[PDB]
Structure 1
């Protein structure tokens, strides 16, 4: 695993965005061979979407031949609702880049047949072959996507019941009223994420310090699903300063020596 120890959220966003751009450009995507990008929502990836849009407007990246897939979506939330993940992605990213509408893949949280919806989402990923880079965040309790505590480490896309802790945390986007936060969500599984060629997790805030510790210095377990990255051949965690407070001095020392040149470029 690689851990990029940065200082602020702005730096984190620039590093991640630059990493996404370089992967795409080195890939040289065509209509017959597109780049598949997995994406998350929430407050964590904000600086990354900002930096991505900038680089596109500057002519550094084209999403013309990039296919996207989002991690999850709320069940029973009107698609028009500003806090649905469909609205988040368009407002913060899709509306600003040259990506074709046919290249966008989102889960339908209002699907009449939930099992069928989830299964087809997996079929769609399979038809492309693989997700080259899946970007995500991590929950306070350590969930990756909405794979809450006690989720199988070999799980696929399915419906999941949100933890009370997760709903309280997300209520910040629903006027701070947990009663307005959906109780269920459709989410890619841990196995689905482990199938991606590369996984990049953004970690911001002291609120995520325990989750980072579990991911980096803890054991593999289904209570902190973020620990599944210990089993991935190509995982990267991009962190700000507060989020690294629970790690041992020797651990942080190592990653700082390793990424010194990779980050110190002003």
Structure 2
């Protein structure tokens, strides 16, 4: 597992975006062999999207043969609502890069047969073979996407009933109105994430410090889902300074020395 200890969110997004760019450029994707990218939404990846767009505009990367899969979507919310994850993803990324519509995959929160929607999503991933790089964030309690603590590490794409803490912490978008916040969401599973070739988790804010600690220094346990990334063949935590509060000083010093050459320029 790699830990990239940075100072600010802007540095974290530049690092993550540069990592994505370097994986895409080394892979050399084509129409028949696309690079498959898993993506999250929310405030945490914002500086990464901003930096990815920048690099695209600077001519350093093309998304023409990049296929994407998003982690989740609200159930029963119209796709064109500005707070849908569809809307977030276009406004913050797809509106500014050269990816074709047929390459973009998002869960249909309005599908008539929800279990069918979830089944097809998993099938579509398998039609390409695998996600090469899945970027995500982590909950304060170590959970992933809308999966709950003690989720099966093999769980799959499925509908979830959001937690009060989550409606609550999202009611702001439903202009600060915790009654309109959709009750349910579609989310990829933990197994869906773990099947990716590489997993890169963005960790921002002292509210994630216990999760960072559970991921990096704690032992493997299903109650802190993020800890099971220790068993993943290729996992990376990219973090800012406030998120490191619960780590030991020597842990932070170890990774700061091991990755020093890699965190220049960004």
With structure 2 as the length reference, what TM-score do the two structures score?
0.97
Distance across 1 between alignment mates of 2:246 and 2:176:
28
Report if aligned partners of 1:139, 1:166 keep a CA contact under 8 Å in 2.
no
Residues 139-180 of structure 1, C-alpha deviation per residue, up to 9 Å, x if partnerless? 122221111223111101111122222222222322232222
| Cα pair 1:138 1:145 within 8 Å, conserved | yes
CA RMSD of aligned residues (A): 1.2
Determine helix, strand or coil for the equivalent of 1:73: strand
CA distance in 1, matches of 2:222, 2:110: 28
The size of the alignment, in residue pairs, is 266
Q: Which moved more, 1:72-81 or 1:232-241?
A: 72-81
Gaps of 5+ in 2: none
SS in 2 for 1:135: strand
Q: Structure 1 residues 151, 88: closer, same or farther in 2, change over 3 A?
A: same
Q: Counterparts of 1:80 and 1:253 in 2: how far apart (Å)?
A: 46
Q: How far apart are 1:247 and its partner, in Å?
A: 0.8
Question: CA–CA distance in 2 between the matches of 1:125 and 1:21?
Answer: 21
Which moves more between the two structures, 144-153 or 57-66?
144-153
Listed as ranges, the gaps of 5+ residues in structure 1 are none
Given that 1:190 and 1:228 are in contact with CA atoms closer than 8 Å, whether structure 2 keeps it comes out as no
- State the distance in 1 between where 2:110 and 2:217 align: 39
| Contact 1:83 1:173 (8 Å CA) reproduced | yes
Q: Per the alignment, do residues 150 and 167 of structure 1 end up closer, same or farther by CA in structure 2, a change over 3 Å counting?
A: farther
TM-score (norm 1): 0.97
- Per-residue deviation, 1:129: 0.3
Matched, 1:60 2:60: yes
State whether residues 78 and 110 of structure 1, in contact with CA within 8 Å, keep that contact through their aligned partners in structure 2: yes
